[PDB]
Design a protein around this nucleic acid. Structure first.
Lengths: 475, 243, 258
DNA sequence: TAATAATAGTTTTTAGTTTATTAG
DNA sequence: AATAAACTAAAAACTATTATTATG
């Protein structure tokens, strides 16, 4: 989707944040945000501009205003530029080549920010500005507030917290504006997507269909694919690769490709065309079979992640009306739709259960279970597997009670997003370290090692007391 | 095949277990053999690359490549030998369980992975078998689902997973399904539908839909004999692609 | 071109960021014709290292090449020729180079064919970790023999290595609790401690040089233990200890009697 | 004669290639 | 001699993009 959110970092240089110094963790948070952005999304833009210095590096040459990074996609060079001033020696060298606190005007810095925002040549979905100062400085104040209001009217968002901590110093900026602790790299390796799956037609019957918007919500994440860069020049090769004639010499052709499967006595030689046409059974869409109760489910037959189904009022108008009716009926009916589904041409059909997904808006109106249906794959006969019989022994009421007492002592709310992949996190951290010429960044287990290893004594372990077998079962 | 490992409930108190691939999207047994046009065998058939340098016809070999990654505006060089130490280290074929929650919090919607495991105990370990039976009965009674950090082997990947038992008169075990990582939680804001003043279904449409639902019931209704029978059992039909 | 000996041989300046920028290192190898690469390749002679990052540590973790400080390069840059490696501008040993520090060097920067100077000795000794894990008797036995076998027992400030004196700082001898206060009698012990002298505070077999300070009436107590021990101690003035190291020497008992 | 047509190259999934443990 | 971490083609959409046949 076109348009992104633009955030620019503005930090005062008034020799008041030089004394940990506010400038220090301000720079640290800016670096952490830039790292999170470069690991999250590259379509966004970042800009670093300073004011109050003794140097006037800016396009219109305004006093004390210094620009360091203009609005551009995040880059490692910007990270190094930030890091060269991160340290205390970095702070003093920064103050040397930039200049210490001097006179300025907030109208000028807002004007420069507006010019920088206008400099971009892309549709830019949102415009936000982050500002940092310990205390409010403010004539100058009147013009500054007027210009800030004008920019806010133009569609510019502002953000700031005083760097003293509490809720004490925002007096001169009470009206100017329309917390950075969470921005301190608390989020890492985020993934952002804006597109949607292929919209199809709901073949509910033989004549009328519904334009259905397919949406994936929990699709599996994976590391980005590697590139085959050269050893010395460190740039990828054209990667030319296709089968040619080796035994006889020469070049092979796609028309020369014959496919076969050696079965029994002879190899049934064919061509590809038969192979793709074999995969063809019907047209893309969801051919509805009927309704079947949700209670009539094996409750353990998941095979492929579910996909959300939404109306798309772009090819038929009945999508929204009929889906709203069905969802209303989904209150009274617990039967689920049975559909033969094919994402595209030459795909074997799968039987699909449309579990009612009714919207559950919370106090903040979070779209929990968005209004529509989810695709539930139904396994075939071959998808099932045999299982050797096991009906040896049951349990005793004493044992089940003891196990209940052991387990319900430890309970968790199960926050869904509480876990991330340690492999992907470590991979991202390694790439970050290599891109910045550093040591091993850190290791942080995503609760993969159970915390019960230390709090088992806290929960009062009793299965150790209850060894049902004289010979140790846990040998 | 079985997955002979140990259920690490708690710090120690491990329980011998064996797991099997229960439900899986089946693949074809034999892949197509691309044979020669006229010889119909593998003489001029081979998979190979040139790795020509992007230039003017200079090329490169396997030792000449570096597995870089697109770090946004640029590509940082990296190699598999670097991956050898710059990777997460697993601990064997562990079955570490870490958390316990209520079955209400989890969702059939949030069932991820690409396989199903019937979490059985080990072979003829009566003490472990009865302990597992007691644990699964307790979990079922309290609807108290378990969180499992799973790894197939030393070279596998960590896998958060949900555990809830299955009870029958012929087989009794625990069902394991891979839980997500927060990266997988893709979000897409959607407009509400029940408040669609522009598209509000008429009550005549509502009653027609009710009649349609009643007519196209694909399962026998539970009578006095509890005849909740699937008139169209999909699970007992093999994939038509193979036939 | 200039130092074309570096040419026809590939060098990997991968980190090269201790104090010299990479392009300058990349440039300097160009007027010398040396081949520069950005990855560890078998044709690379050695890795020109800079800062200690994770991946150069991996190169150190690996045994693919040789990890080299820029000092060797600068030595090669200034001399315009190859310089044999020494454990002062060199980091990590490849199997080919493992013997290089073993062929003409034993275990440290010390060589077998290049005479070591004060700078070499200081760097070699600095490379050796500092730890005195040896009991004072062994300095008197073996380490004192360094000044004996090689004739250094005449050193000015350390000549009591084998001379064991009596720390005469007590009003009454054979009692170690009546320390004399306000006097400079402890200088004899520190001067003894300035060398390998076993400073035995009480009259023992070690006591052989009784350095009489401001009290000479204590000689009667010395007579009690002058026969109970084999190496008899003799009444000596402060010139034997107190003034001897002040004069930076080791006086003799006969010339310092009483 | 001064509009909308088919139209590329995006990412994004999705299905088809490769090395560890059972069988002798 | 099986399963599965870990590569490798391949097939929609959400964006810019151009030829109509607008008329003498």
């Amino acid at each position: 989707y076109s348009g992104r959110d633009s955030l620019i970092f503005l930090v005062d240089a008034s020799k008041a944040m030089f004394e940990l110094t506010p400038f220090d963790m301000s720079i640290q948070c800016i670096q952490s945000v830039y790292i999170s952005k470069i690991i999250s999304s590259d379509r966004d833009l970042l800009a670093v501009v300073f004011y109050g210095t003794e140097k006037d590096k800016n396009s219109v040459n305004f006093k004390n205003i210094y620009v360091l990074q203009e609005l551009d996609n995040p880059g490692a060079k910007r990270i190094l530029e930030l890091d060269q001033f991160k340290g205390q020696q970095g702070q003093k060298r920064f103050q040397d080549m930039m200049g210490h606190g001097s006179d300025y005007s907030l109208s000028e810095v807002l004007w420069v920010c507006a010019n920088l925002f206008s400099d971009v040549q892309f549709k830019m979905s949102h415009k936000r500005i982050m500002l940092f100062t310990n205390e409010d400085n403010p004539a100058k104040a009147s013009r500054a507030r007027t210009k800030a209001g004008d920019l806010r009217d133009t569609g510019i968002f502002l953000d700031l917290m005083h760097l003293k901590k509490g809720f004490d110093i925002s007096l001169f900026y009470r009206d100017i504006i329309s917390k950075l602790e969470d921005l301190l790299r608390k989020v890492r390796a985020k993934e952002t997507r804006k597109r949607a799956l292929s919209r199809l037609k709901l073949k509910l019957n033989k004549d009328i269909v519904i334009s259905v918007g397919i949406y994936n919500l929990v699709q599996k994440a994976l590391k980005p694919p590697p590139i085959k860069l050269y050893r010395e020049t460190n740039e990828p090769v054209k990667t030319k690769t296709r089968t040619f004639n080796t035994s006889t010499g020469g070049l092979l052709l796609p028309s020369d490709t014959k496919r076969s499967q050696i079965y029994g006595s002879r190899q049934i030689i064919l061509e590809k065309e038969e192979t793709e046409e074999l995969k063809r059974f019907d047209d893309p869409g969801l051919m509805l079979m009927g309704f079947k109760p949700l209670v009539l489910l094996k409750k353990h037959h998941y095979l492929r992640p579910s996909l959300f189904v939404y109306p798309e009022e772009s090819l038929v108008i009945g999508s929204s009306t009929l889906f709203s009716a069905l969802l209303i009926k989904c209150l009274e009916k617990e039967v689920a739709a049975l559909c033969r589904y094919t994402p595209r041409r030459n795909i074997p059909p799968y039987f699909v259960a449309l579990v009612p997904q009714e919207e559950e808006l919370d106090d903040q109106k979070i779209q929990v279970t968005p209004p529509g249906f989810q695709l539930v794959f139904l396994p075939f006969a071959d998808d099932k597997r045999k299982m050797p019989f096991t009906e040896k022994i049951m349990a005793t009421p004493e044992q089940v009670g003891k196990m209940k007492a052991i387990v319900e002592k430890l309970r968790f709310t199960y926050r869904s997003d509480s876990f991330e992949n340690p492999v992907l996190q470590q991979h991202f951290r390694n790439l970050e370290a290599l891109a910045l010429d550093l040591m091993e960044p850190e290791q942080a287990v995503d609760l993969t090692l159970p915390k019960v290893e230390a709090m088992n004594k806290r929960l009062g372990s009793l299965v150790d007391e209850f060894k049902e077998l004289v010979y140790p079962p846990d040998y | 095949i079985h997955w002979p490992c140990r259920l690490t409930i708690g710090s120690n108190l491990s329980i011998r277990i064996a797991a099997y691939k229960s439900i899986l999207q089946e693949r074809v047994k034999k892949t197509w053999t691309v044979v020669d046009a006229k010889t119909l065998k593998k003489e001029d058939i081979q998979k190979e690359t040139v790795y020509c340098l992007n230039d003017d016809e200079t090329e490169v070999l396997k030792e000449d490549i570096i597995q870089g990654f697109r770090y946004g505006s640029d590509i940082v060089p990296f190699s598999k030998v670097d991956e050898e130490q710059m990777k997460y280290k697993s601990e064997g074929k562990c079955f570490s369980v870490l958390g316990f929650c209520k079955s209400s919090q989890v969702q059939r919607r949030f069932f991820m992975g690409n396989q199903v495991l019937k979490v059985f105990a080990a072979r003829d370990d009566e003490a472990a078998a009865v302990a597992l039976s007691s644990l699964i009965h307790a979990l079922d009674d309290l609807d108290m689902v378990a969180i499992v950090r799973y790894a197939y082997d030393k070279r596998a990947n960590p896998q958060v997973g949900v555990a809830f038992p299955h009870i029958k008169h012929n087989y009794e075990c625990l069902v394991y399904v891979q839980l997500p990582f927060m990266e997988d939680l893709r979000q897409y804001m959607f407009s509400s539908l029940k408040n669609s003043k522009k598209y509000a279904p008429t009550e005549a449409q509502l009653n027609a839909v009710d009649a349609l639902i009643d007519s196209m019931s694909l399962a026998k209704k539970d009578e006095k004999t509890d005849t909740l029978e699937d008139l169209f059992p999909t699970t007992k039909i093999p994939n038509p692609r193979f036939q | 071109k200039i130092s074309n000996i570096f040419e026809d041989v590939e060098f990997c300046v991968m980190s090269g960021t201790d104090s010299q920028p990479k392009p300058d290192l990349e440039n300097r190898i160009a007027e010398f014709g040396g081949y520069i690469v950005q990855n560890p390749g078998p044709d690379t002679y050695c890795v020109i290292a800079g800062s200690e990052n994770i991946r150069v540590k991996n190169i150190i973790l690996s045994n693919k090449h040789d990890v080299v400080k820029p000092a060797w390069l600068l030595e090669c840059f200034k001399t315009k020729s190859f310089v044999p490696w020494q454990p002062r501008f060199m980091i990590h040993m490849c199997p080919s180079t493992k013997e290089h520090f073993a062929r003409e060097y034993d275990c440290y920067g010390d060589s077998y064919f290049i005479d070591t100077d004060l700078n070499q000795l200081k760097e070699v000794f600095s490379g050796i970790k500092n730890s005195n894990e040896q009991t004072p008797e062994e300095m008197a036995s073996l380490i004192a023999d360094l000044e004996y076998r090689y004739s250094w027992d005449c050193s000015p400030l350390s000549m009591f290595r084998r001379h064991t004196v009596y720390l005469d700082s007590y009003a009454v001898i054979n009692d170690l609790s009546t320390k004399n206060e306000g006097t400079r009698l402890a200088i004899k012990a520190l001067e003894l401690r300035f060398h390998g002298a076993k400073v035995v505070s009480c009259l023992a077999e070690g006591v052989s040089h009784v350095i009489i300070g401001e009290d000479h009436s204590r000689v009667a107590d010395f007579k009690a233990f002058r026969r109970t021990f084999k190496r008899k101690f003799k009444i000596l003035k402060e010139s034997w200890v107190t003034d001897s190291i002040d004069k930076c020497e080791l006086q003799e008992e006969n010339q310092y009697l009483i």
